[PDB]
C-alpha cells in the first residue's frame, strides 16, 4: 500500500564509551556545523553535536586540547573528558553520527567505485565535440516518524557532469561563466559562479593560507598544487562561489540540467530500479555498520493512506462536477466568471490554414461563452530554423502594446523562450504547438486551450465549491534574493492572496532595495498591509504557504504582524526538492501520505502520469492551530486552481510558479511594484 525511501534506523553500540569536547569560548550557529566536521577530522572518530558539547564515538588516547581552525581563520579550542551514551535526543545527532560512519568505513566510496566498474559504459554519453558522465550521488538524511522512530531517508540521484574540468573549460573557449552551478570533486556541495579571476593575481602565502584553511582533502591537494606548481598557478583561475567559498577552477566540475536529452532520460529509471538499487545500497551499509552497532530495517515504510480533499468545482451558473481529469463535458457546457467581456489579442505564427481554422473555432467557442477576442495584430514569422529566435526577438520586444493575451503558433527551448519573455512583460501567453494540432484530437486541444485562456484573463472557467476548513485567505509567498559577497543586494517578493473558494483575490510583485532586516519585515508587512487594504477584519484565519523553507526571520515577522493586525496565522513551508519518493503501481497516488514528527507530511499532490516523474512534496506546519491533514487537503484542492485539467501540476496555486517568477524579476534592470488579479503565468 505504497512504499517509500524510509527505513527504521537504530543505534545500540557495543563500546558505549564517548569522549566529550566543549569549547572554552562561545556558541556560533553557522560555525557549529563546521567545527563538528573538524572535530571528526582531527579525531578520526564519528561525532555528533549535543547542544554545546561535541560527543565523539570512542577513545582517543592522550587527548587534551583540540585546536581546530575554521574557514574564517578563527582558531577554536575545546577540551573535557568522558560520558556514556544513552540514545539520541535529535534526528540531527543520529544523522551527524551515521554520516561519519559512512565516511570512516568508506562504504559510500566502495559503492561509487563498484557502480562505475559495471556501469561506466552506461553512465557515459557522447556527442560531437563533447563528452558527459551521469555521476551517482547518494544522499542520506535521518528523519523521525509520527510515532517516534528515526527513519533513514535514502536516495540515489544522478549528477550530470562533463569530463572536462572548469579549468580545462575556461582555457579553451570563453563562454558565459556566471550562474553556472559547479561542484568540487570530493565535496557534497553545489554553488553558482559569482567571480572568476587569475591565480597569478595572488602570491605564494595565499595558496598556503587557503590550504591551511581548507575543510576537505581534495581542496588541500588543489591548493597544494597551485602553490607548488607554477605552470598551473600562472594559467589557473580561482572561482568565488555564492555564499563566499573560494575554490580553484582545477577541482570544479560543472553541473548540467535540461540527441543528449534522449540518452539522458534513461536516468529517470523505473520505480523498481531505484527501489532495488536503494535496496542494494542498504545491504552494504549494514555489513559495514552492524559491528558498530547500527541497524537499518530491510523493509520500506508504507504510506498511511489517501487523504480525500474537496475537488468539486463549479461554474457561473453553478454546475457541479468532481474533478478527477475535469470533464471535457463540464468544460464544454460551463459558463465562466467574466472579468473582461471583450479582449485585445496579438497573434504570432512561426511557420515553414490549420492554425487559422483553429483560431476561428477557438474565438467561436469562447464567444458562445461570453468572452469575445478582438484581434489587434497578426505577426507572421517565417522560419528555416533557429534564425527565428532572432526574428521572434524583434516582435516580442514590441508586444507590450496593451494586449490582454498573446496567442503563439509554433512550428522545446522554443516554448520556453517565448513564455519567459511574455512573463517578463506580464502579458498572459498561450503557446500552441503545431505538433499538438497534428497529433491530438482537435476538440481536446480546443478544450485544453479554452480552459487555460479563460484562467489567464481572469474569466476563470470554474472555482471550488468548498475547501475543507473555514480559512479566510490563502497567501502564498516566495522571496528570492541576489547574493553578492555577504549582505543582500537585490530581492523580489511574489505574494498571491486567495479566497476560501480558491479564486485569486490579488497578487503582489515587488522588487526590494538593499537593507538588513528591513527587507524581510517590509516584504511581509507589505503583505499584511495589502490584506488590510483588501478588507480582512481582525480575527480572520490566514494560511500562508511558503515556496521555500521559512527562514527564522520570516517566521518572526509573520508572528509579530499577525499579533499587530490581530490575525489567526497558519504557516506552511512547501518543500518540493529532495523528498522521500512513493513507489507503487497504483498510478492514482494523488492524496497519498506518510506523516512525520513536527507536523510534517510527505504528500502526493498529483497522479503518476509519466514514468519515474513523481516528486512528492513535504508540507511542514511551522506555526498553526489547524491539523496538517486539514492543511494538506486544502493544498490538494488548490492544485485545481491551476486550471490544467489535461496536464498535471505538482504545486498548489498559492506557490505554483512563484519561484520561477521571482528569479526572473531579479534578472531585471528595473524594479517592480505591481499588483493584479490575473493569473498571467499559466
Ligand atoms: Ca526561493
Copy the grid coordinates of residue 672.
Answer: 517592480
Copy the grid coordinates of residue 652.
Answer: 498548489
> Which letter, b or e, does each residue of 625-656 get, where b requires 16 or more Cβ atoms within 10 Å of its Cβ?
ebebebbbbbbbbbbbbbbbbbebbbbbbbbb
Residue 544 CA to residue 494 CA, distance in Å, equals 13
CA of residue 12 to ligand 1 center, whole Å: 39
Domain boundaries, the chain: 1-160+260-306, 162-254, 307-465, 468-681
Q: Which residue in the list 291, 517, 598, 677 is annotated as catalytic?
A: 517
CA of residue 657 to ligand 1 center, whole Å: 11
Distances (CA, A) of 233 to 197, 200, 211, 215: 12, 6, 14, 21
Distances (CA, A) of 430 to 14, 404, 452, 655: 65, 11, 8, 21
Please calculate the CA angle 95-100-101 and round it to the nearest 5 degrees: 100
659 is in an annotated binding site: yes
Residue 559 CA to residue 569 CA, distance in Å, equals 7
CA of residue 522 to ligand 1 center, whole Å: 17
15 is in an annotated binding site: no
Contact 510, 480 (CB under 8 A): no
Q: What does 403-445 look like in DSSP terms, one character per residue?
A: -SEEEEEE--HHHHHHHHHHHHTT--EEEEEHHHHHHS-HHHH
Residue 490 CA to residue 148 CA, distance in Å, equals 42
If you ran DSSP here, which 8-state letter would residue 115 be given? Answer: H
Contact 636, 602 (CB under 8 A): no
Residue 247 CA to residue 241 CA, distance in Å, equals 8
109 catalytic? Reply is no
Question: Which residues, other chains included, contact 394 with Cβ-Cβ below 8 Å and sequence gap of 6+?
Answer: none
Residue 186, number of CB atoms within 10 A of its CB = 12
CA of residue 480 to ligand 1 center, whole Å: 5
Contact 20, 81 (CB under 8 A): yes
402 catalytic? Reply is no
DSSP-based three-state secondary structure for 89: coil
Q: Which residue in the list 96, 301, 547, 573 is annotated as catalytic?
A: 547
> Nearest to residue 662, comparing CAs of 547, 578, 530, 531?
547
CA of residue 68 to ligand 1 center, whole Å: 34
Distances (CA, A) of 579 to 391, 576, 601: 42, 7, 10
Q: Which residue in the list 300, 315, 478, 573 is annotated as catalytic?
A: 478
Residue 547 CA to residue 543 CA, distance in Å, equals 13
> Nearest to residue 487, comparing CAs of 447, 463, 519?
519
Structure-determination technique = X-ray
Query: Phi, psi (5° rounding) for residue 539?
Result: 100, 20
15 catalytic? Reply is no
Question: Which residues, other chains included, contact 128 with Cβ-Cβ below 8 Å and sequence gap of 6+?
Answer: none
Query: Phi, psi (5° rounding) for residue 527?
Result: -60, -40
Instruction: Name the one residue in this structure whose C-alpha cell is 530581492.
Output: 491
* β-bridge partners, 135: 159
Contact 239, 166 (CB under 8 A): yes
517 catalytic? Reply is yes
Contact 523, 493 (CB under 8 A): yes
478 is in an annotated binding site: yes
Burial status of residue 597 (CB atoms within 10 A of its CB: 0-12, 13-18, 19 or more)? middle
Instruction: Name the one residue in this structure whose C-alpha cell is 481536446.
Output: 444
Residue 275 CA to residue 294 CA, distance in Å, equals 21
Give me the CATH code for the 307-465 domain, please: 3.40.50.2300
H and E: helices and strands count for the chain = 20, 36
CA of residue 479 to ligand 1 center, whole Å: 6
Residue 584, number of CB atoms within 10 A of its CB = 19
Half-sphere exposure of 413 (CA within 13 A, CB side): 7
- Residue 652: enclosing H or E segment and its boundaries? none
Question: Which residues, other chains included, contact 82 with Cβ-Cβ below 8 Å and sequence gap of 6+?
Answer: 17, 18, 19, 20
> Nearest to residue 325, comparing CAs of 435, 447, 430?
447
Contact 575, 655 (CB under 8 A): no
Question: Which residues, other chains included, contact 416 with Cβ-Cβ below 8 Å and sequence gap of 6+?
Answer: none
CA of residue 192 to ligand 1 center, whole Å: 14
Q: What does 183-224 look like in DSSP terms, one character per residue?
A: EETT----EEEEEEEESTTS-HHHHHHHHHT-SSHHHHHHHH
Residue 85 CA to residue 599 CA, distance in Å, equals 28
CA of residue 347 to ligand 1 center, whole Å: 33
CATH 3.30.390.50 fits 468-681, yes or no: no
DSSP-based three-state secondary structure for 36: helix
CA of residue 29 to ligand 1 center, whole Å: 22
Copy the grid coordinates of residue 324.
Answer: 478527477
Copy the grid coordinates of residue 573.
Answer: 513551508
CA of residue 587 to ligand 1 center, whole Å: 30
Q: What does 600-643 look like in DSSP terms, one character per residue?
A: EEEE--S---STT----EEEEEEE-SS-HHHHHHHHHHGGGGG-
- Classify the C-alpha dihedral 451-455-461-465 as positive or negative: positive
491-498 and 504-512 beta bridge pairing: antiparallel
> Which letter, b or e, does each residue of 207-241 get, where b requires 16 or more Cβ atoms within 10 Å of its Cβ?
beebbebbbbeebeebbebbbeeeebbeebbbbbb
Distances (CA, A) of 2 to 101, 617, 619: 30, 15, 19
Give me the CATH code for the 162-254 domain, please: 2.30.340.10
Max CA distance (Å), the chain = 87
Where helices occur in 5-52 by DSSP H, the ranges are 29-43
Distances (CA, A) of 660 to 145, 494, 543: 32, 10, 22
Residue 238 CA to residue 240 CA, distance in Å, equals 7
- DSSP3 helix / strand / coil % (the chain, rounded to 5): 35, 30, 40
Cα separation of the two ends of the chain:
34
Amino acid at each position: 500500500e505504497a512504499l517509500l525511501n524510509l527505513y527504521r534506523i537504530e543505534y545500540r553500540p557495543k563500546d558505549t564509551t564517548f569522549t566529550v569536547f566543549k569549547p572554552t569560548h562561545e556558541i556560533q550557529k553557522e560555525k557549529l556545523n563546521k567545527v563538528r566536521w573538524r572535530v571528526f577530522l582531527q579525531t578520526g572518530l564519528p561525532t555528533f553535536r549535543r547542544e554545546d558539547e561535541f560527543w565523539c564515538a570512542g577513545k582517543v588516547e592522550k587527548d587534551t586540547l583540540y585546536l581546530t581552525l575554521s574557514n574564517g581563520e578563527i582558531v577554536e579550542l575545546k577540551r573535557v573528558g568522558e560520558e556514556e551514551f544513552r540514545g539520541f535526543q535529535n534526528e540531527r545527532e543520529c544523522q551527524e553520527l551515521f554520516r561519519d560512519f559512512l565516511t570512516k568505513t568508506k562504504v559510500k566510496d566502495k559503492f561509487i567505485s563498484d557502480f562505475y566498474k559495471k556501469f561506466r559504459d552506461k553512465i557515459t554519453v557522447q556527442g560531437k565535440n563533447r563528452k558527459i558522465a551521469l555521476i551517482p550521488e547518494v544522499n542520506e538524511k535521518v528523519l523521525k516518524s509520527e510515532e517516534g522512530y528515526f527513519l533513514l531517508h535514502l536516495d540515489l540521484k544522478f549528477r550530470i557532469q562533463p569530463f572536462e574540468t572548469l579549468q580545462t573549460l575556461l582555457e579553451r573557449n570563453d563562454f558565459n561563466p556566471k550562474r553556472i552551478r559547479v561542484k568540487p570533486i570530493g565535496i557534497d556541495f553545489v554553488g553558482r559562479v559569482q567571480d572568476v579571476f587569475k591565480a597569478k593575481e595572488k602570491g605564494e602565502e595565499f595558496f598556503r593560507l587557503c590550504m591551511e584553511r581548507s575543510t576537505h582533502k581534495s581542496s588541500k591537494k588543489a591548493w597544494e598544487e597551485l602553490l607548488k606548481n607554477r605552470e598551473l598557478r600562472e594559467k589557473a583561475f580561482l572561482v568565488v562561489l555564492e555564499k563566499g567559498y573560494t575554490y580553484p577552477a582545477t577541482i570544479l566540475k560543472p553541473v548540467l540540467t535540461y540527441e543528449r536529452n534522449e540518452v539522458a532520460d534513461i536516468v529517470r529509471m523505473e520505480p523498481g530500479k531505484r527501489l532495488n538499487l536503494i535496496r542494494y545500497i542498504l545491504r552494504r551499509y549494514v555489513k559495514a555498520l552492524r559491528d558498530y552497532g547500527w541497524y537499518i530495517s530491510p523493509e520500506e515504510e508504507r504510506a498511511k493512506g489517501k487523504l480525500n480533499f474537496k475537488d468539486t468545482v463549479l461554474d457561473a451558473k453553478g454546475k457541479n462536477t468532481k474533478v478527477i481529469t475535469n470533464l471535457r463535458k463540464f468544460l464544454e457546457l460551463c459558463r465562466p466568471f467574466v472579468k473582461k467581456d471583450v479582449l485585445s489579442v496579438e497573434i504570432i505564427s512561426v511557420s515553414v490554414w490549420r492554425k487559422e481554422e483553429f483560431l476561428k473555432e477557438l474565438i467561436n467557442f469562447l464567444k458562445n461563452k461570453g468572452i469575445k477576442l478582438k484581434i489587434k495584430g497578426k505577426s507572421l514569422i517565417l522560419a528555416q530554423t533557429r534564425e527565428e529566435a532572432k526574428e521572434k526577438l524583434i516582435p516580442v520586444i514590441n508586444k507590450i502594446k496593451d494586449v490582454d493575451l498573446v496567442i503563439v503558433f509554433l512550428e522545446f527551448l522554443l516554448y520556453d523562450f517565448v513564455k519567459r519573455e511574455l512573463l517578463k512583460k506580464m502579458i498572459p501567453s498561450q503557446v500552441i504547438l503545431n505538433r499538438t494540432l497534428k497529433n491530438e484530437n482537435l476538440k481536446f486541444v480546443l478544450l485544453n486551450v479554452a480552459e487555460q485562456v479563460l484562467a489567464k484573463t481572469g474569466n476563470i472557467p470554474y472555482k471550488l465549491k468548498e475547501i475543507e476548513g473555514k480559512v479566510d485567505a490563502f497567501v502564498g509567498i516566495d522571496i528570492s534574493r541576489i547574493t553578492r559577497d555577504g549582505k543582500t543586494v537585490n530581492a523580489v517578493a511574489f505574494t498571491k492572496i486567495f479566497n476560501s473558494k480558491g479564486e485569486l483575490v490579488r497578487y503582489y510583485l515587488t522588487s526590494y532595495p538593499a537593507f538588513g532586516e528591513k527587507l524581510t519585515e517590509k516584504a511581509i508587512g507589505d503583505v499584511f498591509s495589502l490584506l488590510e487594504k483588501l478588507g480582512f477584519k481582525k480575527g480572520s484565519k490566514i494560511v500562508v504557504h511558503r515556496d521555500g523553507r521559512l527562514y527564522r526571520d520570516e517566521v518572526a515577522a509573520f508572528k509579530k504582524y499577525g499579533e499587530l493586525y490581530g490575525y489567526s496565522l497558519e504557516l506552511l513551508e512547501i518543500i518540493k526538492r529532495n523528498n522521500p519518493r512513493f513507489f507503487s503501481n497504483e498510478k492514482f497516488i494523488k492524496g497519498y501520505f506518510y506523516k512525520l514528527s513536527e507536523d510534517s507530511v510527505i504528500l502526493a499532490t498529483y497522479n503518476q502520469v509519466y514514468e519515474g516523474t513523481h516528486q512528492p512534496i513535504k508540507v511542514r506546519k511551522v506555526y498553526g492551530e489547524l491539523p496538517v491533514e486539514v492543511l494538506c487537503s486544502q493544498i490538494l484542492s488548490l492544485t485545481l486552481m491551476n486550471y490544467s485539467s489535461f496536464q498535471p501540476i505538482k504545486l498548489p496555486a498559492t506557490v505554483h510558479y512563484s519561484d520561477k517568477i521571482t528569479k526572473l524579476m531579479l534578472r531585471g534592470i528595473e524594479p517592480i511594484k505591481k499588483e493584479g488579479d490575473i493569473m498571467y503565468w499559466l
